[PDB]
Design a binder for this molecule. Structure first.
Ligand SMILES: [Cl-]
Ligand SMILES: [Cl-]
Lengths: 368, 369
């Protein structure tokens, strides 16, 4: 099976994990602390904190900004459901805005309109743009719009470690950046994530919330347990020095897809993602024409040893985010991407031959 | 250093972890699913779900029972701060009740008084007793009290996997049992925990909440979190579980050695001992020093003599975090005494009787000077 992802954890990392299990510290220790330093340097950001997963990162960012009951956060329609769920979990309302059909990211003009029209009843406090599939497109615009309207910005950069727009590393534009180390997301720790910020007060607050309010040890506030193990930290920091080369490889494979898929684009059978400068290419998602039954395409591809899937969900389609605004607005772009999107294998373990294999299979399936 | 704990992960488990990292599934997989089955069978409970840590287990239990803003949960004064924090984090108010001096667990008579006097304004929905340090004492009383008053019961069994009272395995008495696999807590996965229940509806709800509301196409049934445990952490846990009864048995032998060796210090009035009842899993062995000793100086002196020692747990009422009216109107002299004067001594399955003797020798010397 040509799989969507297959992260290869360096052998030296596996040996370090074994050493830690045998005779080392299991809870967050030197490996996590070094990983945080190294992430901060990689991103050019003042502070990083590693946490249990990327959902935990978003959760902590919301809590640290005192976003909760009575409040609202704008989210894109097209994303993994965690983005909207976590807003609701803190007691805030997820306010959905449609995405761009090209970038698959929150549409800046529709974002502006939403903010312009907002008059409650909840207090609108933040935007949570998603840099979907590693696409940094609109990062700087989101920052500008947030500043223009007095909003916080939490980047849901789950899929975007190593992406960048116009000199800005994704995750670093505003109050918080949130990353995932899930196995589909290029750098993995099995489960893991990170919160980054340039604001030391926000850093200190997340560090308290991550571990029971602990600062001898004093308990300064109520908190949670979102600590990452020391051995998970060891895995992550072993992979980080490889990430740029993995992204470069992914960009080369994306160009191969672009070249080889052109015949299908020309006859209107699918559209391609736009793998802009700075895209980290965590996912390569095409969009099938409406006349294809996507579930049947996925099944046929599986039978030809190609793993494929939808790329993400449409929040407005799920029936979970029922703020009035979301009932009033329409989300054709996110709905199209949710219904017709098709992610194809793209990861650093593949070569050009593997890309051609995938395109051959997809061409065959769409012919029949 | 004779340390408070030092869990030995079996080499075969380390090899299995390496195999998973090299060529296996990293996210919750066959190892977690088998661990859940094996935990359920160990406890004699219908359902188990492994989660990121023991705090996550409590969190999911609260959420599954729809405990939140406008609600109240009773917690013991003496516990790790997570017990009370997690109540507050869901928007409920932690209502503190004192522990008893013998067991260090929530005092049933004071619990009854609190419930009887409760008249709001919040809706009192649950008790969250702690089976502190592996002590099952009062488990069945808590069950009976919750049933008498129409309350849910969430056992904070962080430190009590394998403990039992009068035939009831800790974690299995009522709606939910919550366990921690932190490295201090005998069975470890580095970080980890579990939620158990006999109620299939509660199981199904926690499973949704653990993973984004996902139900297997995947459907999103409700808003949720990510509290999944990795498959490799699950592999560690299920490798250790078959050893846990042997480890507890060894810990109860070591406790009996402490009991014998510390009798002179008890008889002369310098400390009091824990009561290691039938069914105690002996996760922690906490003594209480006489008031004339400065406990922080005792810890520092023991450190200089290669003995790790610490306070056992916190007093919630001391922390200034749980400010419901009720908590201001009560004193908590028992939890205060345990917080201020309690001293945990090394007790884990890697020690032998000679090591216990070493610890007692050191403590005797420190308390003489
Ligand atoms: Cl540890
Ligand atoms: Cl995986």
């Amino acid at each position: 099976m040509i799989k969507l992802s297959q992260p290869q954890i360096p052998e030296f990392a596996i040996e370090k994990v074994a050493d830690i299990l045998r005779g080392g510290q299991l809870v967050h220790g030197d490996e996590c602390n070094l990983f945080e330093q190294e992430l901060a340097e990689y991103l050019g950001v003042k502070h990083a904190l590693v946490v249990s997963n990327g959902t935990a990162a978003l959760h902590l960012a919301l809590l640290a900004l005192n976003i909760g009951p009575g409040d609202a956060v704008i989210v894109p329609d097209f994303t993994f459901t965690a983005t909207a769920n976590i807003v609701e979990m803190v007691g805030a309302k997820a306010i959905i805005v449609d995405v761009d059909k090209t970038s698959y990211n929150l549409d800046p003009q529709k974002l502006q309109a939403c903010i312009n029209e907002w008059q409650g009843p909840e207090t609108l406090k933040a935007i949570m743009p998603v840099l979907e599939f590693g696409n940094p497109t609109h990062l700087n615009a989101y920052r500008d719009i947030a500043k223009q309207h007095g909003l916080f910005m939490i980047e849901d950069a789950a899929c975007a470690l190593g992406a960048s727009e116009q000199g800005t590393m994704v995750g670093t534009a505003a109050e918080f950046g949130c990353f995932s180390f899930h196995p589909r997301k290029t750098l993995t720790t099995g489960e893991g994530g990170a919160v980054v910020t340039n604001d030391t007060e926000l850093y200190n607050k997340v560090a308290l919330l991550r571990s029971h309010g602990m600062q001898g040890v004093v308990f300064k506030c109520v908190g949670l347990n979102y600590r990452l193990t020391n051995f998970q930290g060891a895995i992550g920091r072993a992979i980080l020095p490889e990430l740029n080369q993995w992204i470069a490889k992914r960009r080369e494979l994306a160009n191969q897809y672009r070249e080889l898929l052109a015949p299908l684009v020309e006859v209107g059978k699918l559209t391609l993602p736009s793998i802009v400068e700075g895209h980290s290419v965590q996912t390569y998602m095409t969009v099938l024409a409406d006349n294809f039954e996507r579930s049947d395409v996925i099944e046929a591809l599986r039978s030809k040893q190609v793993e494929s899937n939808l790329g993400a969900q449409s929040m407005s389609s799920l029936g979970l985010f029922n703020h009035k605004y979301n009932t009033e607005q329409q989300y054709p772009e996110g709905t199209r991407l949710y219904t017709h999107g098709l992610a194809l294998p793209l990861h650093e373990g593949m070569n050009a031959e593997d890309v051609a294999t995938v395109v051959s299979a997809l061409t065959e399936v769409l012919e029949h």
